[PDB]
């Protein structure tokens, strides 16, 4: 992403929506739901907050943090080597290696009995209140505004209170800014493109970046002169 994420609160999006005299029955309560539906459906990794925590494993099981949404990696605490996901169908089950993990809910299922792991995960930025804190980026703000407008105009079209050309134009005006908001948060910066250029340009290829925490991924690959 080129732009930094400045955070502003959720009632920023209702300054914009209640400029429209047909969207004047929106609350924060609908916008709390319709922003979580937008933060999720875009899947933008520059919106979530990267946190790292050390959890300990009791017997192939560990308690996972409460604010987790997506795990980046899980590495051992003593070695530092990272755990691949588990393909095993019979993990902790006994009969009569490269370690792996698996997560469903608030549980992580590991392949090792008694250890400590680090978890690099992602969470939502919150407030003094317990509320989502969204970017200030006016392309993220404008397609979030067109999202809640499209989801409020759909109810007003199903009720028979909005013409077919008004929902058709909002569905078109949003679908441009949804593809645009993808490209704001995805396209690498001038600094992030050197991390790709030093990864894409490798005379001797580096294919074991997952054992480290992708630390040496963007390192420039130097060759000696003879």
């Amino acid at each position: 992403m080129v732009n930094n994420i400045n955070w502003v609160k959720l009632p920023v999006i209702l300054d914009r929506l209640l400029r429209h005299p047909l969207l004047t029955d929106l609350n924060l309560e609908t916008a709390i739901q319709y922003t979580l539906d937008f933060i999720s459906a875009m899947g933008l990794p520059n919106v979530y907050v990267d946190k790292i925590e050390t959890i300990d494993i009791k017997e192939y099981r560990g308690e996972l943090p409460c604010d987790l949404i997506s795990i980046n990696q899980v590495r051992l605490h003593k070695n530092g080597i990272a755990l691949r996901a588990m393909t095993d169908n019979f993990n902790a089950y006994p009969t009569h290696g490269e370690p792996s993990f698996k997560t469903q809910g608030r549980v992580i299922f590991t392949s090792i009995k008694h250890e400590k792991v680090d978890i690099s995960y992602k969470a939502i930025m919150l407030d003094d209140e317990g509320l989502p804190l969204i970017p200030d980026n006016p392309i993220f703000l404008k397609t979030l505004e067109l999202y809640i407008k499209k989801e409020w105009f759909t109810i007003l079209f199903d009720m028979g209170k909005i013409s077919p050309a008004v929902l058709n134009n909002t569905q078109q005006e949003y679908a441009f800014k949804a593809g645009q908001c993808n490209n704001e948060f995805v396209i690498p910066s001038v600094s992030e493109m050197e991390a790709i250029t030093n990864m894409w340009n490798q005379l001797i290829p580096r294919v074991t970046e997952f054992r480290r925490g992708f630390k040496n991924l963007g390192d420039k690959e130097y060759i000696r002169v003879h």
Partner: peptide, 28 residues
Amino acid sequence: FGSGAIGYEFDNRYLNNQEMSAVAKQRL
């Protein structure tokens, strides 16, 4: 005599169907 609360809403509902049809022909 006089009462105009059904001839209103039957003339008003006649006018919804004109404009709901008129906005149904609007194409960008």
